[PDB]
Amino acid sequence: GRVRTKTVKKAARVIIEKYYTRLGNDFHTNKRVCEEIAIIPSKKLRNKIAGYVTHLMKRIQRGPVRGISIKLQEEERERRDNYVPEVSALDQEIIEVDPDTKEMLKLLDFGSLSNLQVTQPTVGMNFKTPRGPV
Amino acid sequence: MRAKWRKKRMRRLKRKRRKMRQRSK
Amino acid sequence: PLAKDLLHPSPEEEKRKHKKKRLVQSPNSYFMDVKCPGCYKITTVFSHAQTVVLCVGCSTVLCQPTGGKARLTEGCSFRRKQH
Amino acid sequence: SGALDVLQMKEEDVLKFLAAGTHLGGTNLDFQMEQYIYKRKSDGIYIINLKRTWEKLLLAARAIVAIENPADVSVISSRNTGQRAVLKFAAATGATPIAGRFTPGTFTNQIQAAFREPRLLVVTDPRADHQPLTEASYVNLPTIALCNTDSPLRYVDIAIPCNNKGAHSVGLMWWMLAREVLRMRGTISREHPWEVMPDLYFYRDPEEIEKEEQAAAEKAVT
Amino acid sequence: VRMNVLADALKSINNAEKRGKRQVLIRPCSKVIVRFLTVMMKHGYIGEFEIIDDHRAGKIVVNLTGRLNKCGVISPRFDVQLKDLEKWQNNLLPSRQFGFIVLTTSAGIMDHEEARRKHTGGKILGFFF
Amino acid sequence: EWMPVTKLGRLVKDMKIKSLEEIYLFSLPIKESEIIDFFLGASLKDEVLKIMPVQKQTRAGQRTRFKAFVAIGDYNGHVGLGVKCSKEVATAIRGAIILAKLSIVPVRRGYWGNKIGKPHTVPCKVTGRCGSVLVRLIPAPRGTGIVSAPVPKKLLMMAGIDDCYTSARGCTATLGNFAKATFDAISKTYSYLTPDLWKETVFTKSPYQEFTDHLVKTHTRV
Amino acid sequence: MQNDAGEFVDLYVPRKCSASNRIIGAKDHASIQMNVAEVDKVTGRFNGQFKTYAICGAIRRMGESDDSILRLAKADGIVSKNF
Amino acid sequence: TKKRRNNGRAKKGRGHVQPIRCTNCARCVPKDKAIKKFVIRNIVEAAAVRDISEASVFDAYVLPKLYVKLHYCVSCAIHSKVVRNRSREARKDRTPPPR
Amino acid sequence: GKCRGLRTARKLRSHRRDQKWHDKQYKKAHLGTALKANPFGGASHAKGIVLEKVGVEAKQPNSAIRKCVRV
RNA sequence: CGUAUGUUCAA
RNA sequence: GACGAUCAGAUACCGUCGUAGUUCCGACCAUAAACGAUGCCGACCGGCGAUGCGGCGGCGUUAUUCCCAUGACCCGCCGGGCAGCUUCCGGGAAACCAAAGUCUUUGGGUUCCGGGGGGAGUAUGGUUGCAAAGCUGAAACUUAAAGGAAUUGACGGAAGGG
Ligand SMILES: [K+]
Ligand SMILES: [K+]
Ligand SMILES: [K+]
Ligand SMILES: [Mg+2]
Ligand SMILES: [Mg+2]
Ligand SMILES: [Mg+2]
Ligand SMILES: [Mg+2]
Ligand SMILES: [Mg+2]
Ligand SMILES: [Mg+2]
Ligand SMILES: [Mg+2]
Ligand SMILES: [Mg+2]
Ligand SMILES: [Mg+2]
Ligand SMILES: [Mg+2]
Ligand SMILES: [Mg+2]
Ligand SMILES: [Mg+2]
Ligand SMILES: [Mg+2]
Ligand SMILES: [Mg+2]
Ligand SMILES: [Mg+2]
Ligand SMILES: [Mg+2]
Ligand SMILES: [Mg+2]
Ligand SMILES: [Mg+2]
Ligand SMILES: [Mg+2]
Ligand SMILES: [Mg+2]
Ligand SMILES: [Mg+2]
Ligand SMILES: [Mg+2]
Ligand SMILES: [Zn+2]
């Protein structure tokens, strides 16, 4: 019967977002931190919040979680933006097209004007999964 | 009372009534 | 499609639609010029023929009735007639 | 494109669409998306018409530009393959993005915290983002969508026929939409190719991220 | 079987009108249908229509302008005297400001207001508004 | 006092929008009762049609709640109907009045057969359906008055209709459905295409673009 | 609405759908009025003029708002005739 | 109130379907209405399959299976927990439960 | 549905004549059995002789002795 | 395996 | 029907027997929740995957030893059918229905048939039948509800989880 109520969890997640840098994996230090950065009216409540904070810190330090943490934030921007390849994936020497869209590109008056290769069309048109149960 | 048995009740009642008139004619 | 032009449908659209349901009904059948490998003369044969057409004089079967278009005898060349 | 040679499709765009597979639709066809396909391939795949893709793309761009305040344009992608593409578009054009979960009540609950009243809505997929499209119906909100061959068109006013499934094509279509919006606004030059690479709007699954980061790390160390 | 070509035509126009279609195919075609359509055309309720000749009853394609609320037939074709025309108007038309009752009279097929002007009663064909 | 939360409420308070018909013209969803109070505050008159208790069966007994039907409207082209259910009668009435104001629609009034003077009747025969109740509004000769039951007669007077013949079918004892059906009939007067509305519509500026600059200056901060 | 004199007695004149020509009612919250900006002939850049289209809620519900807008644009020259 | 569009049975374009007898109680049930269950299982249970293996006289003898087709009336199917009650919308689902 | 042909006046008249017997208000006043069976014989009032005073027990959910007379 | 019943009115 | 159980009783459910019947042929009977509880003929009105029959078209696979056609399969179209999914077509008291829609914006044609619940499908007359009965079919009198669909609870010798 050790499930923590929303009041324990709401305080603990907030403390790690707000004061992550001053927290760590030790319950005893975290317990002392909560005494000055928060007004916890009872000692038992304080030790429960510090308990969850200690549990969260391990998880927030081995991966991202519901809680936000600048260090994890500044990496998300870097992947989402910083990884622009040297050459685009679209920049391909040979682009493969089937005679169907090649004749379409002829309507696009772009057929023979491009650097593209024509594949042999697929034969048999077996593209539907067999019908039946499951 | 079930309608089917209410029908059976009346059929038996009718048969009795027809015997009562076949006896008087 | 709310605004579909019913006066001028595509020939592909008319060719798909049922012959009676076309804008102006037309048969899907036709007549043909059948030449059996023997002799030289040409026979006019209905596409959906119901009778076994015999090349008179030559006395050979030109087409066999089916549930639809008549089945031409093997070795017989046919060409669609135009009206 | 108003049959204007300045807005015609260039050979550079054609290679971009072909490379990203934007011309390949699904095996199913919506009856209201019939006018946008070209021909079914021999493997059941419907080919989307690129002229019609371009026309609707520019028609969508003209609708976006008509909104005076760029913040009044909302761009949404519930699916992850398009969350990065949408936020960039919102950074490059000043739109208000909603990536990830769309909380119901956003456009209709006046007292909700994230309550907003956009003048124009752009979504990545009508099926996935069905909540914003259905909700827009309560507040007189015109809607623009990227629709595949098998995509419903209910409450969708401008549908851009494109492969809104593949990662490359979804990002490319948002890139082309962003570029065309800026060109009409005059923010960027039209004869000069855009500085933003198309790959910046491409969603990258985690497996590729750790694969390439260690490849870059081993490249740097040696 | 088809007992009334005019009823089939007016119903077909009414359904396409409600569905927002721009054109409706009407089959088969009759002089009564064409004269009825003309009465609606002269009042702007429908656009141009093209009768199509099939060496048969005929087909028509009507251009719909999104103005009809309802084009309904009256069956059977009751005889309408001039005195009883007003009671027919109160029963068939939403208001006297608009809407017409199409009458077939000896003078010709015409709307109820033209019949009143020409002082001719007749047999009622239908209505539109 | 009134701090508007919606853009429409912001423009109304800033006196940028005049008359409800401009809001009605673009069919904007009103979401604040103060907008209605701003335009028609003095002329609106309210009436409690019915206080109908409803009960929910529970273990401990019957949970009685009170439903209030309130009809609102100035006696000149505007009428609204509001239904609210709550634990208290007084709370239900106040909530119904708010909902009644939010529901106000413009009433189109026409002429029986003259076109002399101001409009006195409904433009044409209009029917309203709610559940089994069918209420049919019929144009009436000038000087006829309102020939109806007491329930629709209150709504029709509040709509400003001066002459109207009526025809009700169904369980009119269901005052909730009876009133709603009448309200539906009145509502669709302006949804009925009379040939006088045939002339091509001229498109004006939406309030969200005509005052897009004012909204950016104020509503972003407020 | 005008009396015999010709004074406008309607409270307001409601818009009509640009495709179905139905009146857009005061409570039709699914209706839209979407502006499509017109570019300069040479620049291809918003010059300040826009085309306006109104669609009623019913057309949007049917999913026909796409072809209504597209067909309106082709009529207005926004979309090339060889679409 | 109608509960099922197909009236609880698979009869659509015919008048009469021959009945069959329930496997448990032998009640007459129409063949299209009977809850059917084609049971395939090994003659020997998985507990005893090991003992038969080294008791067998063959090096690689595959155990024959038991093919029994059961037909259940509605009462027996519900009682024997072959089928259960479902909600309003859960009833409409027709795919068999996952393996 | 109902017939509507221009020469169906007899069929419509005949049908309404038959279906008018199916509401008890019409059949009570037009069959004659009701008037024959009516103790007043179609009169508003009637005189009589009190045979005896009788008490009728009121129906549930009430309880009382209603005072009556056999006449 | 195998059991049935619950006086009248009344919130 | 007999019997054995079960039970307070058990003229039942369970079990052991078992007559009529069940079966074939010939003559009757004319009713069923004879149900899609939904008349028929005709027109219009969304989409999608199938399916059965017929025809037409088309890469390719397989047998017909090679050819030929023909079959088996694959991809479509058309027509008639049994249905299914979806839909703010529209309707409806709702359950629901692509018809139960195109209805107060009320009329394609036409047949049968209902008018609060009972009494009562009873009486009586006619008619059919070997009979059982079928068909036609009232009245006196009595009554303020009977009923439909759906909601919330409670209950269940219903299920599932605690
Ligand atoms: K009592
Ligand atoms: K079929
Ligand atoms: K219940
Ligand atoms: Mg039941
Ligand atoms: Mg059902
Ligand atoms: Mg079953
Ligand atoms: Mg009566
Ligand atoms: Mg008593
Ligand atoms: Mg009492
Ligand atoms: Mg007792
Ligand atoms: Mg007792
Ligand atoms: Mg009791
Ligand atoms: Mg009490
Ligand atoms: Mg015994
Ligand atoms: Mg036995
Ligand atoms: Mg019967
Ligand atoms: Mg049967
Ligand atoms: Mg029946
Ligand atoms: Mg017959
Ligand atoms: Mg068949
Ligand atoms: Mg009727
Ligand atoms: Mg009765
Ligand atoms: Mg008899
Ligand atoms: Mg009482
Ligand atoms: Mg019943
Ligand atoms: Zn059983």
> CA D166 to CA C58: how far, in whole Å?
67
F150: CB partners within 8 A, 6+ apart? none
- In DSSP terms, G51 is beta-bridged to G36
Tokens of D85: 């593409």
Nucleotide closest to residue F61 (CA–C1')? K153
- Token pair listed for E9: 């035509």
* Closest by CA position to D24, among listed D3, D42, D7, D11: D42
Contacts of G22 in chain E (CB under 8 A): 20, 66
> CA Rg, chain G, in Å?
16
- Among F123, F104, F116, F106, residue whose Cα is nearest residue F163: F123
Contacts within 8 Å (CB) and 24+ apart, H26-31: H27/H73, H27/H75, H27/H76, H29/H71, H29/H72, H29/H73, H29/H74, H31/H71
Q: Which residues of G touch D59 (CB under 8 A)?
A: 36, 69-70, 73, 78-79
Tokens standing for residue D142? 């015109």
Distance H32 CA to ligand 26 centre (A): 15
Domains and CATH numbers, chain E: 1-68 (3.30.1370.30), 69-129 (3.30.1490.10)
E96 contacts E43 by C-beta, under 8 angstroms: no
Interface contact D140, partner G, CB < 8 A: yes
What contacts 24+ positions apart, CB below 8 Å, involve D30-34? D30/D147, D30/D149, D30/D150, D30/D151, D30/D152, D30/D153, D32/C1, D32/D152, D32/D153, D32/G63, D32/G64, D32/G66, D32/G67, D33/D147, D33/D148, D33/D149, D33/D150, D33/D151, D33/D153, D33/D159, D33/D161
Tell me how far CA of residue E76 lies from CA of A34, D117, E10, E13, in angstroms: 91, 56, 15, 20
The C1' atom of K157 and the CA atom of C78 lie apart, in whole Å, by 83
Q: Between A27-37 and A43-62, two packed helices, what is the crossing angle to 10 degrees?
A: 120
Token pair, residue A7, equals: 């009041």
Which residue has tokens 């008055």?
F145
Please name the residues in contact with F68: beta carbons below 8 A apart, sequence gap of 6 or more. Answer: F48, F50, F51, F52, F83, F84, F85, F89, F92, F93, F95, F96
Tell me if G25 sits within 8 A of G14, measured CB to CB.
yes
- What fold characterizes domain G1-82? Hypothetical Cytosolic Protein; Chain: A; (3.30.1230)
Neighbouring residues of E18: CB distance < 8 A, sequence distance ≥ 6: none
For residue A96, which of A118, A78, A74 has the smallest C-alpha distance?
A: A118
Cis status, amide bond into H97, omega within 30 of 0: no
CA G31 to CA G68: how far, in whole Å? 13
Answer whether G55's CB lies under 8 Å from G49's CB.
no
Tell me the C-alpha distance between D173 and D177, whole Å: 6
Q: Comparing C-alpha atoms, which of H65, F8, A68 is closest to residue G29?
A: F8
Q: Which CATH class is domain F7-106?
A: alpha beta
What is the DSSP secondary structure assignment for residue G48, as one 8-state letter?
E
Query: How far apart are the C-alpha atoms of F106 and F73, rounded to whole Å?
Result: 10
Burial (0-12, 13-18, 19+ Cβ within 10 Å), H85: exposed
Cβ pair E5, E27 in contact under 8 A:
no
Residues of chain I contacting E75 with CB distance shorter than 8 Å? 4
Of D150, D179, D204, D160, give the one whose Cα is nearest residue D30.
D150
With residue F108 as reference, give the H or E element that holds it. Answer: none
CB count within 10 Å of CB A95 equals 14
Interface test with G, best of F99, F108, F190, F199 (most G CBs within 10 A): F190
How far is D201 from D88, CA to CA, in rounded Å?
Answer: 6
What is the three-class DSSP state of E24?
Answer: strand
Task: Note residues around ion ligand 8 (Cβ under 5 angstroms).
Answer: I 60, 63
Query: Residues F48, F50, F52, CA angle at the centre, nearest 5°?
Result: 135
Q: How was this structure determined?
A: cryo-EM
Residue F128 near residue F183, CB atoms below 8 Å: yes
With b meaning 16 or more CB within 10 Å and e meaning fewer, what string describes D153-185? bbbbbbbbbbbbbbbbbbbbbbbbbbbbbbbbb
What span, in angstroms and rounded, lies between the C-alpha atoms of D137 and D141?
Answer: 6
Q: Looking only at Cα atoms, what is the longest distance across chain D?
A: 59
Which residues make beta-bridge pairs with E124? E103
Question: Between the CA of G75 and the C1' of K73, what is the distance in angstroms?
Answer: 49
Closest Cα in chain A, distance from residue D1 (Å): 15
Residue of G nearest to F203 (CA): G52
CB count, 10 Å around CB of F37?
15
Distance, CA of A134 to CA of H95 (rounded, Å): 7
DSSP D190-207: SSSPPSS-GGGG----HH
Terminal-residue alpha carbon distance, chain F: 14
CA of H26 to C1' of K33 (A): 23
d(CA F177, CA H12) in angstroms, rounded, equals 40
**For strand D120-123 and strand D73-77, is the pairing parallel, antiparallel, or unpaired?**
parallel
Helix (H, G, I), strand (E, B) or coil at D81: coil
Q: Which residue is nearest to nucleotide J11 (CA to C1')?
A: F61
Report if CB F61 to strand J is under 7 Å.
yes
Q: What is the distance between the alpha carbons of residues D4 and I16, in angstroms, rounded to a whole number?
A: 74
Residue G40 CA from chain centroid, whole number: 21
Which strand K bases fall within 7 angstroms of a protein CB? 36-51, 54-61, 68-70, 74-79, 81-86, 88-90, 92-97, 100-116, 120-124, 132-133, 139-141, 143-144, 148-150, 152-154, 158-160
User: How many Å does it take to go from CA H14 to C1' K35?
Assistant: 13
Residue G21, chain E, CB below 8 Å: the answer is yes
* Cα–Cα distance, A61 to A26 (Å, whole number): 13
Q: Which residue has the tokens 């009740």?
A: B9
Angle, helix F89-102 to helix F33-40, in steps of 10 degrees: 70
Going by their DSSP bridges, the two strands F105-106 and C31-35 should be labelled as: unpaired
Contact of D27 with chain A, judged by CB distance below 8 Å, is answered with yes
Mind giving me the DSSP string for chain H?
A: ----TTTTS---S-S---EEE-TTT--EEETTTSEEEEEEEESS-TTTHHHHHHHSSSSS-PPPEEEEEEEE-HHHHHHTTSS----HHHHH--SPPP-
What are the structure tokens assigned to D157, written together? 């006013």
DSSP letters for E87-107 = HHHHHH-SBTTB-EEEEE-SS
Of F139, F193, F198, the CB nearest to E95: F139
Three-state secondary structure call for residue C31: strand
Residue where the block lists tokens 């697929």: A122
User: How many residues does this entry show for chain C?
Assistant: 83
Q: Shortest CB distance from A79 goes to which of D42, D168, D209?
A: D209
Residues in CB range of G2: below 8 A, 6 or more apart: F115, F196, G8, G9
Could you tell me which residues come within 8 angstroms of residue F213 by beta carbon, excluding any fewer than 6 positions away?
D68
Is H99 touching A (CB cutoff 8 A)? yes
Local structure of F211: helix, strand or coil: coil
Chain C and chain G share a number of CB contacts under 8 A equal to: 10
How many residue pairs bridge chain E and chain G with CB atoms within 8 Å of each other? 13
- Output the CA–CA distances (angstroms, integers) from residue H77 to E35, H30, H32, H72, H99, in the order listed: 68, 14, 14, 5, 19
CB atoms within 10 A of CB H49: 12
Instruction: Say how far apart CA D56 and CA A38 lie, in whole Å.
Output: 56
CA distance D102 to D76: 8
